[PDB]
Design a protein around this ligand. Structure first.
Ligand SMILES: NS(=O)(=O)NCC1=CS(=O)(=O)c2ccccc21
Ligand SMILES: [Zn+2]
Length: 258
């Protein structure tokens, strides 16, 4: 009876095995654009992905992860609200069964069709496992996806999904350049939060880009053909693998733009 996104093991049930689900800085949250405040102390955000080395892609029964070699500073995020260097370890998406839902963060309650999470860990902690024991151990760069024109840089990902249809399957996935998933502007909102899937650890500095990327209906439709179940099991389409917005509580969301 492991956590998932169904009626019986979904978001409303997570608190039983992971009490921190009702914690003080859970994610995602709704971003009230009018209440967010421009912060002049934010340094410019630096996304340096030119040396990124992707390794493989895996369906873990919740989403699919594109994993990177994080044994050296090859793809890093720095600046903005961060102190130090954060190394890219993997990226994944959360999407819906329909275009009107799918994102985890919302903007003035508006839901996008999907959301990309590029996960990074603070290099001062030595590794991912150690970073998730720290309040500033992780930085996740979130990018909204809306349905419109196709995103060329996402097609390589789309085309390999047929090979990892079910839970547990993985495939070689080298030379994928994450720069192809970035919108033009780096304007963003930032707030302290958590992982949005169990263990829901509160170690994340969230950086959510204001500008969404556009993906085609055909690209998102292929995400929805994936399976939550393992091979040879009854088919449960992988859709709506998003956690709804959580209480903001004692937090202020800062904007990098006026
Ligand atoms: N939506 S989210 O971004 O909070 N989730 C990310 C996540 C959760 S994890 O601890 O399974 C893990 C292991 C390795 C790399 C990333 C992750
Ligand atoms: Zn995520």
């Amino acid at each position: 009876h492991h956590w998932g996104y169904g009626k019986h093991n979904g978001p409303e049930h997570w608190h039983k095995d992971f009490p921190i689900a009702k914690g003080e800085r859970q994610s995602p949250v709704d971003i009230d654009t009018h209440t967010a405040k421009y912060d002049p102390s934010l340094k410019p955000l630096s996304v340096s992905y030119d040396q990124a080395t992707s390794l493989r892609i895996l369906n873990n029964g919740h989403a699919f992860n594109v994993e990177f070699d994080d044994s050296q500073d090859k793809a890093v995020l720095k600046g903005g609200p961060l102190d130090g260097t954060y190394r890219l370890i993997q990226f994944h998406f959360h999407w819906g069964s329909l275009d009107g839902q799918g994102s985890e963060h919302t903007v003035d309650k508006k839901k996008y069709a999907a959301e990309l999470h590029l996960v990074h860990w603070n290099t001062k902690y030595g590794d991912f496992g150690k970073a998730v024991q720290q309040p500033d151990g992780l930085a996740v760069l979130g990018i909204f996806l809306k349905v419109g024109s196709a995103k060329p840089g996402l097609q390589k990902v789309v085309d390999v999904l047929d090979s990892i249809k079910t839970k547990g399957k993985s495939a070689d996935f080298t030379n994928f350049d994450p720069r192809g998933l970035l919108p033009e502007s780096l304007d963003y909102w930032t707030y302290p939060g958590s992982l949005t899937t169990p263990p829901l650890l509160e170690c994340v500095t969230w950086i959510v880009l204001k500008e969404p990327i556009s993906v085609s209906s055909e690209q998102v439709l292929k995400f929805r053909k994936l399976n939550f179940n393992g091979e040879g099991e009854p088919e449960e389409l992988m859709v709506d693998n998003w956690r709804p917005a959580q209480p903001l509580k004692n937090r202020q969301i800062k904007a990098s733009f006026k």
